Amino acid sequence: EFNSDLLLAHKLPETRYTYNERDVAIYALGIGACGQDAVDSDELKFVYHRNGQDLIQVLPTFASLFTLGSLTEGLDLPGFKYDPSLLLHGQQYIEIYRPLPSKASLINKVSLAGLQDKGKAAILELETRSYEEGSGELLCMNRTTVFLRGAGGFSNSSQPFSYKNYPSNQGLAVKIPQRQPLTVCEERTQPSQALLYRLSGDYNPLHSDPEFAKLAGFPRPILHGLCTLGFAIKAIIKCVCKGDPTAVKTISGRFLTTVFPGETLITEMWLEGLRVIYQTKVKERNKTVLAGYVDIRGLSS
Amino acid sequence: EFNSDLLLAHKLPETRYTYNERDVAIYALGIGACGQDAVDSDELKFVYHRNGQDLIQVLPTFASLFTLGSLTEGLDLPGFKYDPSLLLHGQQYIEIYRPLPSKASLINKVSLAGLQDKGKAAILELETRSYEEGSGELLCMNRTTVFLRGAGGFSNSSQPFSYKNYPSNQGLAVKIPQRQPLTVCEERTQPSQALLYRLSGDYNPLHSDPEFAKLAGFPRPILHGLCTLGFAIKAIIKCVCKGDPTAVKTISGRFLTTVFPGETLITEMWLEGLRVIYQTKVKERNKTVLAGYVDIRGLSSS
């Protein structure tokens, strides 16, 4: 019952998403803004402004909230079924075309960017393009890569189905350079980090419910992968971009191991031209949990 | 009078662009579609269709017409002046997000993507984002890179101004692999190629007027670089993409040497994953005129 033509021709429905400056600030606190210093000049601008909360600046990983809903709700594709509870989020890819406003109404155009038959699992890549309702301008684009356990085996083993409808270098794993890191930044997450971060939209019991997380194989609920990503990109903004969030042009994050709220995240950064290569480790268990890159603006001044 | 902040905050006005299926076919003929064979199944679909001309397919380099006008008129940027006649077109970069329709009404939002003080010249990069009027969807994006002779020295030479507002890997020069090419395709351009291609929009006398071209430093009028680019990308569509223009997702082309209408273009191609690395030479003078890459769709069922 799987036909590739029908699936490639299928059109996924568009979405609306609305947010305001209070949503922006709750997100920023959810990913640790001013977590260590209330008067941190670099990070205070993400949660407060003397002339009104509408003037706070948006952290670029906020754009990841614009995808929420599709994959875990269901998302019916012609000739391709999967179990959403065994879904794993493999990587996130974000491109920021314009600085994100502190409030907006978005229209999200969604499209199937990739599908691979991997034997027992399938890899699915969904693209969300977020247009601002007033201007009509494209603010950003997200590509979400999920590992759909149990969803494989829908095509012929002689030629497994592989589909990539985007430039293949985007989100490619980049090797960690052999030299010492340019800058290392360390930040502790709060014991309640997941309970606060989930108020930005992702209410998955896996990050809040002890019993549910035990049944998933974890001794306590685990921090959202996208929260970890927010911490890392925040660190890059602080330690490489001189505090300016609008320096961030692309974000690639590959998720590796689980993080538990209350642990300390260490982000190591290298600079390769105008690409920041980075890696984030949990200090306590000394495990790498996140890796990727950030393309940044070049400006001599 | 040059301030970096004032320039970065400056917003360029948007433009409208309209085309139909006749514009598409004239373009396709302008970059050599069916140049060698009228009944070529691979290329006839770019200029004719059994069920009406509106069902012809659009060659992706057609999107380069959506930029025309900007740099050549003048385009005033705060604190930065330049002479548009001393403009040289260094590279083109195109991203195709959806296959281009055979007729459209576009809104082009334009923005300053890059500016460099290179001593006596400046490098300027303009981005055009083309939205379809009905859907509002972003069809494609162009980045045009021009070397503006005489425009340098606008910043303190003590710290030359460099500004790049896009992911720097896009359009990077990629090394030609040391192995032999996967595929080579060669096509003769027509002596009148530039006279036909300019009817798609670029009426610069440099490609049509013998006296004007001599005064620019050329023995005869030269073919538009974007015409050469059309030839290269068409060759890649036929020789790598099995004839499907919608396989093309990205186009980078760096212009290197002059081409004269009537010369024969040789395109060499290499495959590195889903990136085609390419190079175009003029057969007669054995000179490289164009180089870049094309990112293509991956689809196992093709």
Swiss-Prot record, chain A:
InterPro entries documented for this protein: HotDog_dom_sf, MaoC-like_dom, MFE-2_N
Tissues in which the UniProt entry reports expression: Ubiquitous.
Residues of the MaoC-like domain: 177-289
GO MF annotation: an example: oxidoreductase activity
One GO CC term on file: mitochondrion
Pathway: Lipid metabolism; fatty acid beta-oxidation
EC number: 4.2.1.119
Gene Ontology biological process terms, A to Z: fatty acid beta-oxidation, unsaturated, even number
Residues reported in the UniProt entry to bind substrate: 89-90, 118, 202-207, 225, 255
Principal subcellular localization: other
Domain of life: Eukaryota
Catalyzed chemical reaction(s): a (3R)-3-hydroxyacyl-CoA = a (2E)-enoyl-CoA + H2O
Cellular localization per UniProt: Peroxisome
Assigned keywords, A-Z: Fatty acid metabolism, Lipid metabolism, Lyase, Oxidoreductase, Peroxisome
Protein purpose: Bidirectional monofunctional enoyl-CoA hydratase 2 involved in the degradation of even cis-unsaturated fatty acids. Devoid of 3-hydroxyacyl-CoA dehydrogenase activity.
Protein name according to UniProt: Enoyl-CoA hydratase 2, peroxisomal
